[PDB]
């Protein structure tokens, strides 16, 4: 892997959509938190070794979907992850698919359950960079923790960002805008105030947004992206060795996981290299 400054949309080869012999294990989990008893899936990379430490990426489904959608026949994201890790395009990581369904949970308020229940449950059981899952242990491993999502799950992602910068450094909002404001500048300012309160430097948080040029999400995302670009908090470029903000728009892509899985193929290899604990040249 090498960073590009303006990475372009490129679908995974069609071969990546079929099962790979080097298949990561997908574990169905059940936990109880502030929204009652709920499930999530945990993708473990092929060769997962609990004596090693893995990057972790939490990835939210869209409206009318559930914690099983992303690894279902409708999406098959695990095949793409399996092929990309096997081919060395993507460093091995843990991918979690939770749900905003259940109890008092909504796409907007999921971050509260994420903080209190989901991180402690997943990262007590599986080997992340978290030494412990106290607030301190989670915060001290933030550079190795990412959140993303599609549509309503992209809205989850923006609310995770504004409320969880202490816990998460890498954000992948796909086809979803941040509902918090009466203008694009209010949206940008809300994110800027979150960043100000966090104390973090511009080198300590990263946003790879994406959508399709034929995805309705573009209408509200693009103005938000333009307003954020104007902030001093963001240096626009996909080269995260130099800046921290990018917006990939896939030509012709519609509001459909068939396209959105390719955004994760394009974007997820960009994550978790800044202050990484390996000696890599990107």
Residue numbers in the entry: 16 to 297
The authors write:
ID30A-3 (or MASSIF-3) is a mini-focus (beam size 18 µm × 14 µm) highly intense (2.0 × 1013 photons s−1), fixed-energy (12.81 keV) beamline for macromolecular crystallography (MX) experiments at the European Synchrotron Radiation Facility (ESRF). MASSIF-3 is recommended for collecting diffraction data from single small crystals (≤15 µm in one dimension) or for experiments using serial methods.
In a first experiment, we collected diffraction data from a Se-Met derivatized crystal of ferulic acid esterase with the aim of de novo structure determination using the SAD technique (f′′ = 3.7 e− at 12.834 keV). The transmitted white beam then impinges on a liquid-nitro­gen-cooled single Si(111) crystal with a bandwidth of 1.5 × 10−4 used as a monochromator for MASSIF-3, which delivers a beam at a photon energy of 12.812 keV into its experimental hutch (EH2). Data were measured according to a strategy proposed by an EDNA characterization at 100 K from a crystal cryo-protected using Paratone N and were automatically processed.
